[PDB]
Design a protein around this ligand. Structure first.
Ligand SMILES: [C][C][C][C][C][C](C#N)N1=C2C(=O)[N]C(=O)N=C2N([C][C]([O])[C]([O])[C]([O])[C]OP([O])(=O)OP([O])(=O)O[C][C]2O[C](N3[C]=NC4=C3N=[C]N=C4[N])[C]([O])[C]2[O])C2=[C]C([C])=C([C])[C]=C21
Ligand SMILES: [C][C][C][C][C][C](C#N)N1=C2C(=O)[N]C(=O)N=C2N([C][C]([O])[C]([O])[C]([O])[C]OP([O])(=O)OP([O])(=O)O[C][C]2O[C](N3[C]=NC4=C3N=[C]N=C4[N])[C]([O])[C]2[O])C2=[C]C([C])=C([C])[C]=C21
Ligand SMILES: [C][C][C][C][C][C](C#N)N1=C2C(=O)[N]C(=O)N=C2N([C][C]([O])[C]([O])[C]([O])[C]OP([O])(=O)OP([O])(=O)O[C][C]2O[C](N3[C]=NC4=C3N=[C]N=C4[N])[C]([O])[C]2[O])C2=[C]C([C])=C([C])[C]=C21
Ligand SMILES: [C][C][C][C][C][C](C#N)N1=C2C(=O)[N]C(=O)N=C2N([C][C]([O])[C]([O])[C]([O])[C]OP([O])(=O)OP([O])(=O)O[C][C]2O[C](N3[C]=NC4=C3N=[C]N=C4[N])[C]([O])[C]2[O])C2=[C]C([C])=C([C])[C]=C21
Lengths: 430, 430, 430, 431
């Protein structure tokens, strides 16, 4: 057991810091003047372009697939540094990574060659999206006896026809609402969409994932793909994640990611478990910005007293708590991503670790931001400091990427209740 | 011991609910279009007008002084209903109340008659402000050997001359930056503002409070009173609490609230202790709105499952923790304001109880809003629900009205450390 | 709304204190030399004797029934004082109170007069016990489709025959294992005990409560009523709540408490709800002793430094948190018991308030004891201080009287989910 | 970065597990019958003998000093397995390790060769004790202008004379109150012990460590070393940490660990910093036993319902929270001991990491035990389950080894307040 960083991992850190400082710091002056969520998102376009130019999109795809991703620890380091400065654009990079994951993870060399090509070119501003989330929710999408996903697909000849609405998927409508360069649309198979999911068939057996590109949307009637809305979010105000409606939206059979059923579900599960671990790095980045801002302040400001406020035990107690949360969180992320890369561990083991990581790091990040504000006091509440932005951004994390209460705690509970559950396999082996 | 409400307490609730429902609900339409903090405050003026017309400003003044305040429990009931709906204007009323408290509490019948007049009239939109807070902080304003308040006063002839800066005080610049109708300016006495506070002099012995009206300001040179800025707040985006500079600002000696010294400090301390108790009702109002919005959702929405989400043990646990926090908070506030009104108890007992109240209610109000959001899930993060507003609003409370970490816990610690401290005196008697 | 105590409330406190100080302080010298739970329980007989002599058992029965209970606030005040000194004997009194509650609550004046008789006499050491808890658990005793209670009753001729086992009920085997002077044995009605509970009938319709006295036991074969064992408890080491087997145990039909079904369930529910509210006073008593011991220590000990440790912000912070938990807890208890006594309120309102109180008071009491230990430091871990006993004692409360996790949160959840739920009805009315 | 365990690390776990299960499980039958703290301690002697025989005392000493300790991660693994089963005897072993640390960390080969010898022999039941703590407290022992340690020392001829009292030090009296085989006695230097510490001199400059063996004690008058008492503890009921009084107790100058002053204080700090990191594994063992008992119960008991209670969200939530605390705790411990072993890092960086580790792991262990008890319910409260023992044992951890409130939070705060404080140096290197 070793925690030492390789030269390539310290370089990744240096590269991410340089990009965030020289590029991402200029973003706010552009997006802040815009009047709504989409406009703010479109204002980030030049910065994403610079991310592509800096090789950061290509770094979201494994080397075997023509990308430059060195490992998930490198990835975790990059994301922490990025989110400690500016989640605008940073969020777009990782949302694209997620949107690429089902293609990355499938075992279809032709699909990989064809659909990952734009993202490994180092050109343009291509966006990917994993379109899973829906207006009615998704915590219960696999509940046997329940309605299931409300975006459905049926096969008609050599094509699939998609019917229904998505809500929340990042980048899903692309820069201009004519679509992400690649969307992986997750559907429930239904020959007759006006009828309820069969309560006697396992929902996981009816899952399909269809690859939709801008070409696919262009080859369809205009009214077959409509953007109905764009949520105004409490924080991450520069992201896009619209409300989309599919109506008789035709997709070539060749665009079907794999055979419908447990394998399709598994691709979705694996993608979202990988994101569950990586989200920890984002949360640490945000909470670290908070902690660091409060630490610098506490060590340089006396608040009209005789000594720097760090010298008061209650203030120090808050900063200690912040520090501990960030330290424990990073260790857990690095544990989780390494666990996920370990070919000798069973899925159950990797999944459970990923669930722990998402739950802990996101819950604790919020406490860290809030405790940092309390320590600084009143001055943390005005927008000449980072905290108002950080407070809104940090509340995203426990809720998104499969919220802790409805999704991640349930996924974990399910593993723990299996007769063969081995709690310590990721540490002490089977 | 009795918890039953009188018909007048019930009417106070009804009256406050109706005002919030019929008047306050219309405020957002007006302030949401405005570009900055001051503009948003100005947009709020017609609603403070209606609050005056509804008698709510007169209700901030005791009956023996020409006001209509029935009791502090009536007050606590009104504040909860207002803040449950909309802190805009509601904050202005309560900030005015605090700005009036030093005059309400003094032993000067002539001063009371003169200065409370416009506030008990039922007319106009008159604003009051207790101007204590400062750019450098105030947590250590009473520390012997420290720099002390940086807003100072010296007597010259039959006038006092104020030098220095205030920051944060609600309403202080009035509607137009020409002054609150009444500001109580808290100063440290210094015949030479260039020299440090005497470290062998108890800071409390040097406190003066000077009454400043729009007339006082108009009778001074142009740049003797300057508004240097207006903080943009995370929440309560329609209040005004500017950065003010006094330069050789002359005030008549007749406007000095009382003899400078311990009695002046006493009036400030007492006003802030009353507001420490009342603030709990504000926190309750915000957190209650969060709880109720989450509760309705939970009992009407299945999130794509087969049952309402309140039927999941994890969801119910969150709503349970919310309800418990709200219930204990309200009991504590009523206990505290009732203790304040009890002539048999000595100040230190009333003070310790008010500190507890402020600390508890404001800390747990934050947790209540956060748990409500975790129970609702992703939907809580978009502005078509209240939570984004409530999250920014609730974080004000542990920070403002004397922060828990620097001020209130320290005030409580000091009382607990006294040799004759009686922990249960507010309950079981001395 | 009023918090002021009457002369009788103040006398009840004074009386409880004198009894705790003069009588209870001497119990430890007797029970400490004993070898097992029963030996320790039996060694407290002389102190329960004194409690009866001080009228404390008679005080558990309302005045219309020949007892001296003044109110539930008086009761809460009494219990707080007793448990702040010594839970031994104190626990026996309140367990007797619980045992008597179903009789006190029933609609039969002749049952009341016959069975309550020895408890209002002021002589002897009468013990009562509500025999509900079982070896297999009780959290799901009313679950439709579940196995239900495993102590069952069938009617044969003019008598009932009880089959099965109880575990935990305080006082159940009396001083000598020949039985409590009054036991209320809660049973699932089953004509054939070898058959499972019918999954098609609502469990609450099958509840019956049978009154079992030392007479009943003497009138049965020696092997019909067996004590299989006595749990060795972490804390409250002088109580008795043994493992009891009923085999073909015959009970007169006259000794049936009421009609089986909802009526009998209602009496059990009501009894346990009242105890849910009163348990708060016991938890406060224990936590108060912890807080006050830490407080006195903090104010008199420098821990080899230059100042009393209460002058360290981290120490004060712990003491402040303790104080707040205690204050909020007592407010909630007094609110709940008052709510229980208000005939204008629906049962579900009283139930929900009782549930909140049990959950909150018992959870935070544990935190209060631990923090007080943290503040005192290493010294708190040795048995020359109260803390070791208090720690073990305090951990009983979240678990017993219906655990927070399996029972009270579930009872509260059920109420919150009802369509006609009124969260604030106990405060603001229906 | 790597989390995989080596064959020897995996073997250290199997070995520690086998010893706990075959040996330590039998301890209870012997100590449970005794009537007081010392008797219960004395009843564990045969189990400590077996620990020695299994090479576990030798494993508390670095290889270069003739011991068998392979690394602090190995140590962490061992302690977690031991404490998961039985802290009796396990506590004696680690308390000995701490008592050995000042000698292990000193720069005197002759002193190490001589004093560490019985402990690496693989025979007997040798005990070591770091005698720092005192009746009046030690949170403030280094406070300038404060009273300081009340165990003082003065040099008279070629000897040192110790005056004052210790309280709490593990094993300090040995098995029979004739002394631990090696005690490291931490003293404040004072020529006239009736005079207060000079408020103008830095307390750290006055620290001395004097080695005191059974021979030392035998060479003194009887009344010069007396045990005044033995605390009855809430938990870890089989350990000894007596109240000791030194009255004109003579020690050879040859037994002075190093020159009094900052270097002597540094050895104490480093020793206690190392133990701050290792304590985390002790707390993990205790909390882990709680988690595992609750998990087994939750997955095989319906509590009179129609499904196992782990199938209830609120029960799962407690087990999840326990699991997460345990996982985060072990990562932190392993990070901390790895940091401590990193020659490229500054002391302040190592210390800060050790403080964090101690504060977090020990606070969170307590929550883990209590949550596991809440999930099991009423049954966890009776002594036919482990929890009553685990509850009392777990509360020791935030309190001992320098309590979190008075000591470890203050040591950490002090580091954070320095101008050159580097928060992420143990992770991202120094700039
Ligand atoms: C890598 C990282 C990056 C990320 C980004 C993403 C994520 N996640 N994005 C997205 C995408 O892309 N795609 C998609 O699809 N999506 C998305 N998102 C969204 C998210 O994911 C979320 O999380 C979802 O939507 C889900 O949600 P939730 O909340 O979790 O769920 P719901 O269904 O809605 O529910 C709610 C609630 O309820 C309750 N429950 C239910 N059920 C249940 C419950 N409990 C218990 N149990 C049961 N069964 C609970 O409470 C819950 O909470 C997104 C978003 C955003 C904002 C962004 C920015 C992005 C994104
Ligand atoms: C009842 C209702 C009413 C409300 C309104 C008001 C209030 N409060 N307003 C005002 C007025 O009116 N006036 C005045 O003057 N002011 C005001 N404000 C402000 C507030 O009050 C606040 O709170 C103040 O500013 C204070 O703050 P703080 O934070 O508390 O303090 P400082 O000084 O800043 O400090 C900070 C921090 O630091 C630390 N420390 C210091 N010192 C110390 C410490 N610790 C410990 N120890 C010591 N010694 C801590 O951490 C702290 O925290 C206001 C405001 C607003 C926003 C509004 C809206 C309003 C108002
Ligand atoms: C007023 C004051 C007085 C008191 C005393 C009494 C009480 N309470 N005692 C008694 C009597 O008397 N009687 C009877 O019967 N009993 C008794 N106890 C006992 C108690 O009450 C307890 O609490 C019972 O046992 C119950 O328990 P719990 O725990 O709650 O339940 P279970 O069934 O066992 O369960 C466990 C667990 O699991 C889980 N779960 C289940 N289920 C479920 C769940 N979760 C969710 N959901 C569902 N459904 C949970 O976690 C739980 O926890 C007693 C006792 C003692 C110790 C004493 C001293 C006394 C008494
Ligand atoms: C790993 C290994 C393990 C081993 C074991 C040991 C440890 N720890 N042991 C011992 C030895 O060996 N040695 C010695 O010396 N000792 C010992 N111990 C004891 C412990 O360590 C403890 O921790 C000590 O004592 C310390 O305590 P504390 O608590 O921390 O302190 P003090 O002084 O007492 O204090 C208390 C309190 O107070 C307060 N404060 C003060 N000061 C201050 C404060 N605050 C804030 N600030 C300031 N400045 C606080 O709150 C505190 O808490 C031992 C023990 C035991 C039981 C065992 C079993 C073992 C041992």
């Amino acid at each position: 057991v070793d925690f030492k960083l390789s030269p390539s991992q310290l370089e990744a850190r240096r590269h991410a810091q340089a990009f965030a400082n020289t590029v991402l710091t200029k973003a706010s002056a552009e997006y802040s003047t815009q009047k709504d969520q989409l406009s703010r998102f479109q204002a980030t376009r030049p910065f994403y372009r610079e991310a592509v130019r800096h090789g950061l999109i290509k770094a979201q795809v494994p080397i075997p697939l023509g990308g430059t991703m060195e490992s998930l620890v490198h990835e975790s380091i990059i994301l922490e540094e990025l989110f400690a400065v500016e989640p605008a654009t940073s969020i777009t990079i990782v949302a694209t990574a997620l949107g690429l994951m089902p293609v990355i993870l499938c075992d279809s060399p032709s699909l990989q060659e064809k659909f990952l090509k734009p993202f490994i070119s180092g050109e343009g501003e291509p966006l990917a999206s994993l379109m899973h989330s829906e207006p009615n929710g998704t915590a219960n999408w696999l509940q046997k006896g329940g309605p299931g996903l409300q975006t459905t697909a049926r096969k008609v000849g050599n094509e699939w026809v998609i019917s229904g609405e998505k809500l929340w998927p990042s980048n899903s409508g692309g820069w201009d609402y004519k679509g992400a360069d690649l969307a992986c649309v997750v559907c429930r198979v239904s020959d007759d969409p006006s009828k309820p999911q069969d309560p006697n068939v396992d929902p996981a057996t009816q899952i399909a994932v269809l690859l939709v590109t801008r070409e696919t949307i262009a080859n369809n009637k205009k009214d077959a793909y409509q953007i109905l809305g764009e949520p105004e979010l409490a924080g991450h105000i520069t992201t896009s994640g619209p409300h989309t409606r599919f109506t008789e939206f035709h997709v070539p059979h060749e665009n079907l990611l794999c055979t419908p059923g447990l394998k399709a579900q598994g691709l979705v599960e694996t993608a979202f478990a990988m994101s569950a671990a990586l989200v920890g790095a984002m949360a640490i980045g945000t909470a670290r910005a908070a902690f660091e801002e409060a630490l610098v302040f506490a060590k340089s400001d006396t608040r009209g007293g005789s000594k720097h406020i760090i010298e008061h035990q209650s203030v120090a107690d808050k900063l200690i708590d912040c520090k501990i949360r960030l330290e424990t969180s990073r260790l857990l992320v690095w544990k989780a991503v390494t666990t996920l890369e370990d070919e000798a561990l069973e899925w159950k083991v990797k999944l459970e670790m990923a669930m722990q990581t998402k739950i802990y790091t996101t819950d604790v990040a919020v406490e860290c931001v809030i405790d940092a504000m309390k320590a600084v006091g009143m001055k943390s509440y005005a927008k000449d400091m980072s905290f108002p932005r950080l407070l809104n951004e940090v509340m995203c994390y426990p809720l998104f990427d499969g919220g802790n209460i409805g999704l991640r705690r349930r996924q974990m509970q399910r593993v723990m209740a299996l007769e063969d559950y081995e709690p310590w396999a990721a540490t002490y082996g089977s």
